[PDB]
Design a protein around this ligand. Structure first.
Ligand SMILES: OC[C@H]1O[C@@H](O[C@H]2[C@H](O)[C@@H](O)[C@H](S[C@H]3[C@H](O)[C@@H](O)[C@H](O[C@H]4[C@H](O)[C@@H](O)[C@H](S)O[C@@H]4CO)O[C@@H]3CO)O[C@@H]2CO)[C@H](O)[C@@H](O)[C@@H]1S
Ligand SMILES: OC[C@H]1O[C@@H](O[C@H]2[C@H](O)[C@@H](O)[C@H](S[C@H]3[C@H](O)[C@@H](O)[C@H](O[C@H]4[C@H](O)[C@@H](O)[C@H](S)O[C@@H]4CO)O[C@@H]3CO)O[C@@H]2CO)[C@H](O)[C@@H](O)[C@@H]1S
Ligand SMILES: [Ca+2]
Ligand SMILES: [Ca+2]
Ligand SMILES: [Ca+2]
Ligand SMILES: [Ca+2]
Ligand SMILES: [Mg+2]
Ligand SMILES: [Mg+2]
Ligand SMILES: [Mg+2]
Ligand SMILES: [Mg+2]
Ligand SMILES: [Mg+2]
Ligand code: NI
Lengths: 613, 612
């Protein structure tokens, strides 16, 4: 049971690059993600482009998004040596900056914070790649009158933690992050309410904000060194959730997007050395390991600390991270250090392959093949079932995980065991960095996700629609099956080649033949008259132009354009011979079209599919 | 402000968890059992019983008798509090538990066993009382080797017990008196602690005239024979004085080593002489308002702090004496409220006035790591494992904070976090008085039947070595018993296989060869292949550990490793471990892990794992 923690780490970081929204950098290392959500914020007149899509959807939910970047920054703060040695420092910093540059955009003026872009209902009702989304993507904000303490504080924490890890390499950016972190924190602190945080209801409803206030205050303290914030962080503790039948700080759950008091108390213990926080975090970690006060988290037969049905791996690997960080602190109860470090490894190893298979996409043995993800799947027909395989490998994604009995099924709509999301990989990345520091495992040098194109991106299918002594009528259908990256193809055209030697010999002008279209989709489709290709050899063709048609891989009608065209010799004549026409050879009889390779398709004049005579 | 009745109830219960010997069937806990069952066997005397002193298992009669004497004093002073709280039965059972033991320790006139167990050997092992393996020698005093303090302290315990048992059990009261008289005679004739040596380093005595007066006072109350009152008073000029003065010491407090405080309090009530009234009030004043420019230290949060060791023990004991004296008609009127305020303030500090309780299993945020072997319940002779106490020793008052209220709840801090008999003695009496004054209902029908929080007996296994014709298993059984901790000498386990392939090969499953390369216990017996459910071709290998002295008291002690193999004829290739029930999930390495398909039995009863 040996696992390459370095490779797992580099892939977990790369996962977020695949989640990026906005104007993607020229230096990206994949060939399947491209610009998307480019009009984000346009509905309110604010540039809100950037950030990460939440899960297998394209909504930008700022609570889990900010929780994610705050956790990544925490990891970099605790283990920079791991990121430097593994050569991954540059990549995680770029990811941290990607999320935070967007949060800065979301705080355009003091007192205003945009916390979501996209409508859950509108976004989830379409199954296709991010690059060609066609639906409205509304922007939502909170302010003094419509407060969002949890999301504002979670974002302040992300910005503040970003400042901590960026201060050394670029103080100006760190300074800017702190400025926005302070405003968002003040908004959250004064309001003490999530009343205005409504667009995320049912997706990321907030069940607490005092935890976020402490978490944000702790990070502002670390970024500014102003104890004002440390006092504030401690002041919220009495208001944190407690254990039902006692008056003790809650300890039977774990660090997650909705509950960050575990991370806050862990850091408060390290920063103040106060018994209360040491007792609290150890009660939580003990519950996750050896058990405490006659209570322990459930464990699957195969060794996974199982909190509950949704994202079991997410919870276990996040706790593994906290256990690892706390175990290295001098204040940790000496007798628990080994228990905590063993827990860190056991849970991470479960995710990586201890049961005989990996739960990380594109990593290890038998990794998940069908994670619930729209863009990685790459349907061009708005169907979760087509194609029957994922066209892209979204490296590093940690799936939800098995049930309490280690039961797991790899299906695209097992939206409970196979979901993937930013928050699922956040603590995981931190735990991996800690294990790499402990046990190594070499990352793949200069790793990239430049995929081989596995299906022809723009094709054409054709068949004989009608025939007569003086004519041939073809039914052709062009299909946009683009995926590298998925894209609108509005400059497509195709050519139908004929040998008109028989027309010339009959004493008829080959360029005089009547071309026509019985039917076609698209206001712009244009069928040319007969044009010369290689006159010396009597080869001519008909050009069918679809330029202007916004064909995109987002539905049956969307991805295609059918065009029926005919070429006719004079009425009443019988010398027309389609049998010596290049494009007629092997042409499917009947109108039941089949893919053909002798009716070449061009993209902006460049042949991309099929052959010429 | 606090529930004094519940506190009182649990403080009494504390002693039940300290009990050594053959425990009663009416026991209200499921984690303590018979222990120290051979106590006295080295001298041919049944010396079983009594209370273990602190977080250890030595029976130190000086603090033990001080404790029971103080508990009886409380019952004598406040029977009405015990009756109303419905705890009378429980404190009387405790008082009798200690005194029945002291009686056993006085087997013949002039002979007194004052200790069972050796501090050095007892403290060198960290585990539950029920499975102690070390020798526990008995020690005695007699005319040639005297122990005046321990003999008189025991006489006081027995005589005070007689006073409170006289009404309900006059015969036992007489029994206690008979023995009290003999031990006091021993102490009075000898006037020396020269032979009291086995407790050196733990409870060495620094005075015995105080014990002589304390015993004489109780013998007088028990017998009404003026002879004893005269003796009690005759020892006063021999009590320790305050340095450079002829003043009876007043700057310390009532405790196992110095009982002149309790003796003078009682002598004041019994004789009304000014000498005694002045002396006890000088002590109480020193502890409250201060006196002659001197006063005990107080912590910022209100704790009268006497000494680093057991600060709570001293403060709550003085609280008890203050309460008793304050109620007496002879107490200076103006000091009555002062003394009663002190009683409440010191008790409230112990119960939770600083924001947390210093009483195990009581109030808000009580101590979780008291220095106590059996409550912790380690099965590996490790103070550090497990990292939490497997049992809740209700009522135990911890040592207490430093002079700045600093307190660290950790198992290894035996100075501020140990618990002991004497720590709860005066405490119990002060609690009875607070209950009488402010109430607080005890918990109805309270018992300490805990849920089993860890599998008491488990087995871990792994694949030792394999082959095309065999499977070799390495398994380790572990005794992690705690309810109660116990020797598991009737343990066995079964390894199940499906031998359909053997039958199909024309071979007799019962002919396969079983063997063992390594075995930890000398009684380990690995059977040949046996039938279990032949209808489904299920056979098994039975591994019997019966006879093994497996106990929760050490890394090697609690476990037994067994490596066994089952093999088909050499050269054959039909052996298939995959359809074997016990092979499923088996760690494919010599590194073992907890498994649930190799069931463990205790006297034939399956206690861990599943069968096919
Ligand atoms: O009281 C117990 C603890 O509850 C914690 O709160 C829980 C809450 O009780 C529970 O219902 C949700 S389930 C939640 C899941 O955690 C998210 O990861 C998941 O995300 C969805 C997203 O909503 C979808 O839009 C996309 S398509 O898929 C992702 C897949 O993950 O949504 C689920 C439903 O909202 O989790 C809460 C957090 O753990 C409290 O935080 C804790 O304090 C207490 S003790
Ligand atoms: O000089 C001032 C007064 O001294 C009194 O005598 C003191 C003595 O000087 C002092 O050393 C001890 S400290 C002692 C403590 O009292 C015990 O309760 C404690 O018990 C230990 C036990 O020894 C261990 O075997 C077990 S595992 O743990 C328990 C934990 O409590 O041991 C401590 C060290 O031996 O206290 C004496 C009594 O107060 C005189 O009695 C007094 O007259 C004078 S004025
Ligand atoms: Ca929260
Ligand atoms: Ca032709
Ligand atoms: Ca003495
Ligand atoms: Ca078999
Ligand atoms: Mg660009
Ligand atoms: Mg570090
Ligand atoms: Mg603790
Ligand atoms: Mg019995
Ligand atoms: Mg079978
Ligand atoms: Ni598949």
């Amino acid at each position: 049971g040996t696992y390459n923690y370095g490779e797992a780490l580099q892939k977990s970081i790369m996962f977020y690059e695949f989640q990026r929204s906005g104007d993607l950098p020229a230096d990206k290392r994949d060939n399947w993600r491209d610009d998307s959500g480019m009009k984000d914020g346009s509905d309110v007149g604010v540039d809100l482009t950037g950030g990460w899509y939440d899960a297998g959807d394209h909504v930008k939910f700022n609570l889990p998004m900010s929780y994610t970047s705050a956790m990544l920054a925490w990891s970099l703060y605790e283990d920079k040596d791991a990121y430097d040695k593994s050569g991954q420092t540059k990549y995680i910093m770029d990811g941290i900056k990607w999320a935070n540059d967007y949060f800065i955009k979301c705080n355009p003026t003091p007192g205003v914070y945009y916390y979501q872009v996209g409508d859950g209902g509108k976004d989830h009702s379409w199954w296709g790649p991010a690059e060609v989304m066609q639906m409205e993507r509304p922007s939502f904000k909170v302010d003094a009158s419509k407060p969002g303490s949890a999301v504002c504080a979670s974002t302040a924490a992300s910005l503040a933690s970003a400042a901590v890890v960026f201060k050394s390499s670029d103080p100006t950016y760190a300074e800017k992050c702190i400025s926005h972190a302070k405003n968002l924190f003040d908004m959250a602190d004064k309001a003490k309410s999530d009343a205005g945080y409504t667009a995320a209801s049912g997706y990321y409803s907030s069940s607490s904000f005092y935890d976020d206030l402490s978490w944000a205050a702790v990070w502002l303290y670390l970024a500014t060194n102003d104890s004002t914030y440390l006092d504030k962080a401690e002041s919220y503790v009495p208001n944190w959730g407690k254990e039902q039948q006692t008056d003790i700080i809650a300890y039977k759950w774990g660090q997650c997007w909705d509950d960050v008091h575990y991370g806050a108390e862990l850091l408060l213990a390290k920063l103040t050395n106060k018994q209360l926080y040491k007792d609290s975090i150890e009660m939580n970690l003990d519950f996750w390991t050896t058990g405490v006060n006659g209570t322990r988290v459930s464990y699957t037969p195969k060794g996974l600390a199982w909190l509950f049905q949704w994202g079991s791996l997410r919870h276990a690997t996040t706790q593994a991270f906290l256990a690892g960080v706390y175990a290295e602190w001098e204040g940790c109860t000496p007798s628990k250090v080994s228990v905590y470090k063993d827990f860190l490894k056991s849970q991470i190893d479960y995710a990586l392959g201890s049961t005989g298979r990996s739960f990380v996409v594109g990593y290890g043995v038998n990794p998940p093949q069908h994670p619930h993800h729209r863009t990685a799947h790459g349907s061009w027909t708005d169907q979760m079932t087509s194609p029957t395989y994922h066209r892209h490998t979204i490296y590093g994604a940690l799936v939800g995980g098995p049930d309490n009995a280690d039961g797991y099924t790899d299906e695209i709509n097992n939206y409970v065991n196979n979901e993937i999301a930013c928050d699922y990989n956040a603590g995981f990345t931190g735990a991996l960095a800690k294990m790499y520091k402990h046990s190594g495992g070499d990352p793949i040098p200069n790793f990239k996700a430049i995929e081989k194109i596995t299906n022809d991106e723009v094709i054409i299918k054709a068949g004989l629609n009608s025939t007569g002594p003086n004519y041939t009528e073809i039914k052709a259908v062009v299909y946009n099956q683009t995926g590298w990256p998925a894209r609108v193809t509005d400059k497509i055209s195709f050519k139908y080649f004929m040998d008109l030697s028989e027309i010339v010999a009959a004493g008829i002008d080959p360029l005089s033949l009547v071309t026509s279209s019985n039917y076609s989709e698209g206001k712009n489709t244009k069928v040319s008259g007969v044009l010369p290709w290689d006159v010396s050899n009597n080869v001519y063709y008909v050009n069918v132009d679809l330029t202007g048609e916004n064909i995109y891989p987002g539905g049956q009608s969307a991805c295609r354009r059918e065009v029926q065209f005919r070429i006719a010799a004079p009425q009443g004549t019988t010398y027309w011979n389609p049998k010596n026409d290049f494009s007629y050879d092997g042409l499917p009889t009947t109108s039941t079209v089949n893919t053909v390779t002798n009716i070449p398709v061009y993209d902006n004049g460049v042949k991309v599919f099929g052959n010429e005579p």
